[PDB]
């Protein structure tokens, strides 16, 4: 079949014989790796998806009995086989045939089940695909923190975000996609929508209080100056606190779909933002505060502020319990979690002050103390 391959290798399209030249040269020189990289070039070429279907079977064969190269090349080309073919019925036989074919030398079975579950993330199945996704993250907690496989796992949790069940685990994995991005080589033209539903998904993730982790990471705000800055402004307001209800009102109605049923819960989230900011505002000098600034921050009545502080204690970001009879708001611990340069500088201020006070008392006791006691 090797001299029988020279016909259909030689006989080909108009522009393909340029890469059939080096493809037949590396084919005759029988270097499986250079032939492999030429296959990655030919799949990487935007071919017509018309005359490639025979070489899908041909280098599917040569890739099966080549028994040499890391078969993730075969994984990617067979993903392009099913992407060209759109036949999930034989795709399971293909992927299972690779599972029987790929022995245990390198555990690429995480990318196998990633591919299988990925194709099973069609409308046919959701639950057991999610369960074998849970198996994919369950398999290797070892040293391969390469995260290429695990950014493909983020693609699996993105198709799990196509299920409207969970905003949060897509956002928890979107922190991991926030950390596993390398450079801007992947499509800015894509990164518009990546940052767009990343921002909407960051908002609609309902297991979080802060947005300053997302806005803190600079590759997103450097990817969103291309984007229209109506959204960076309100994520900056949702990070830094809404002293207004008009701007967060206009973006509360700017995003039209699905935001009404979430909207009151988002009010319940951003009404905690002013709380944690106003208890992070005054470090000392009458830490005690009152409900009038809270309700003035929240345009809410005094009948609901007990419900508001009960909710704030119900989240558990604050431990403050107020011993008042006449209405007062005394606070304890909350987490800053975002940044404040004024608290960097005030940190240096009270920090240096504490240092020279402890030094002052140490010299003060120690001067007469060493001379009388030693």
């Amino acid at each position: 079949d090797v001299p029988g391959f020279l016909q259909q290798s030689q006989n080909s399209g108009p522009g393909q014989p340029a890469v059939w030249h080096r493809l037949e040269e590396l084919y005759t020189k029988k270097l499986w790796h250079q032939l492999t990289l030429q296959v990655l070039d030919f799949v990487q070429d935007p071919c017509f998806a018309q005359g490639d279907g025979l070489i899908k079977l041909y280098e599917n064969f040569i890739s099966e009995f080549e028994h040499r190269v890391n078969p993730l090349s075969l994984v990617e080309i067979i993903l392009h086989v099913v992407r060209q073919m759109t036949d999930p019925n034989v795709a399971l036989t293909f992927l299972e045939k690779t599972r029987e074919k790929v022995k245990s030398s390198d555990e690429a079975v995480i990318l196998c089940k990633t591919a299988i579950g990925a194709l099973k993330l069609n409308i046919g199945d959701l639950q057991v695909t999610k369960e074998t996704i849970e198996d994919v993250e369950e398999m290797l907690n070892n040293l391969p923190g390469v995260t290429s496989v695990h950014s493909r796992f983020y693609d699996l949790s993105s198709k799990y975000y196509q299920t409207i069940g969970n905003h949060a685990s897509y956002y928890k994995d979107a922190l991991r996609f926030l950390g596993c991005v390398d450079i801007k080589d992947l499509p800015v033209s894509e990164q518009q929508e990546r940052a767009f539903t990343l921002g909407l998904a960051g908002l609609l993730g309902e297991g979080v209080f802060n947005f300053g982790e997302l806005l803190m990471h600079p590759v997103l705000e450097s990817l969103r100056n291309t984007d229209r800055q109506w959204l960076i402004d309100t994520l900056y307001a949702f990070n830094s606190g809404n002293v207004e209800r008009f701007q967060t009102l206009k973006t509360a109605w700017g995003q039209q779909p699905d935001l009404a049923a979430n909207e009151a819960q988002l009010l319940r989230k951003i009404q905690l933002l002013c709380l944690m900011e106003m208890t992070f505002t005054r470090p000392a000098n009458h830490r005690q505060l009152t409900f009038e600034e809270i309700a003035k921050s929240a345009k809410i009545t005094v009948n609901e502020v007990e419900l508001l502080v009960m909710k704030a204690l119900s989240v558990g970001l604050v431990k403050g319990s107020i011993d008042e009879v006449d209405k007062r708001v005394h606070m304890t611990w909350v987490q800053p979690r975002v940044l404040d340069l004024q608290q960097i500088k005030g940190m240096k201020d009270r920090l240096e002050f504490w240092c020279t006070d402890v030094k002052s008392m140490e010299m003060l006791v120690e001067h007469q103390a060493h001379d009388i006691l030693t």
Partner: protein
Amino acid sequence: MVLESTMVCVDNSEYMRNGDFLPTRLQAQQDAVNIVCHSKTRSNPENNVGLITLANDCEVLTTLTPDTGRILSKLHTVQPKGKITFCTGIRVAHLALKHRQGKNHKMRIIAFVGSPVEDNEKDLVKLAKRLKKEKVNVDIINFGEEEVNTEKLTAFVNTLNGKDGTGSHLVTVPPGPSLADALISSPILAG
């Protein structure tokens, strides 16, 4: 007899199982290690041989010892990963010569190169000047080709090779279904 230490640097890339050349010539050069270590054992049995790869994370597979019996075992479980690393493959042996027991054992390091070299000529002259500085007998054994075998590797050897009388030799093997074994046994380095 001949009092010297032997260091080998072995390829573990997937370029050593390619179906053009010998059927996993990793085995063939492993048997070349067997015949040169038993031939050095027959010449002077007290010569010590260390074993290490050219991967990213190189690992001393066996510390330098004249007991090659377990070196025969350590030549297996080769872990065919990675591609190549040239510089720390040199530095991982040439400075590790100073840990040796017999200080009268002279310095000899070879390397089995089955991948194209990733280092530029600027690093080739820093390392060739580095080894010609510390004066180690270095025999360069280059298996397989994608581009030409020696273009800058030639002047890498000539700038690496001082001491024109009985200095180091260069091994350049052509393609051939003949072995690597008797073909590298053709210079005086086997003998």
